[PDB]
């Protein structure tokens, strides 16, 4: 009767259980994590869109997303993020 809430809750819970199973999650922490993930995604998407629109680039691709995440995330996390993302994209292309 209620339109389903679009969240990342199952995947966040799965990530926690993959890390370590002993502890759990509270509802307030769950909302905090959901809001944080949504905000980060919105920031990155807006940055990629703006950057693509600047070079009159009609499309958004891996290069644009990598540049946008380098712009947003500070370099310390950005190095690991771009390394893991490149690994994922290359292995997906291989698959």
């Amino acid at each position: 009767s209620k339109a389903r809430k679009e969240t990342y809750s199952s995947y966040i819970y799965k990530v926690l259980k993959q890390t370590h199973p002993d502890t759990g999650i509270s509802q307030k922490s769950m909302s905090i994590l959901n809001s944080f993930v949504n905000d980060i995604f919105e920031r990155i998407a807006t940055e990629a869109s703006k950057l693509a629109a600047y070079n009159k680039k009609s499309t958004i691709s891996a290069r644009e997303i990598q540049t946008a995440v380098r712009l947003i995330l500070p370099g310390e996390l950005a190095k690991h993020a771009v390394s893991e993302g490149t690994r994922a994209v290359t292995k997906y292309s291989s698959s």
């Binding site: 307030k28 922490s29 909302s31 959901n34 809001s35 944080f36 905000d39």
Partner: protein
């Protein structure tokens, strides 16, 4: 009426949380005035959002949207 309704022990607790050990008298109504200013600033945009939505109630989504528009992002309330 209720501006004085915000009682001075609450401001005392706020000062103790901040970390001070000495309290003057002017800071009481100065805190009252700054709270009134912040409240009016948030409420104006919250009411604008609510009226534009054509709903005649104010919701957590609207207030957090107004806060994010101000720049003081609030987490843990959805949306």
């Amino acid at each position: 009426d209720n501006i004085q309704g915000i009682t001075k022990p609450a401001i005392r607790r706020l000062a103790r949380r901040g970390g001070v050990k000495r309290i003057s008298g002017l800071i009481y109504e100065e805190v009252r005035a700054v709270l009134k200013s912040f409240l009016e600033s948030v409420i104006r945009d919250s009411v604008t959002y609510t009226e534009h939505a054509k709903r005649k109630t104010v919701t957590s989504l609207d207030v957090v949207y107004a806060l994010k528009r101000q720049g003081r992002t609030l987490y843990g309330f959805g949306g």
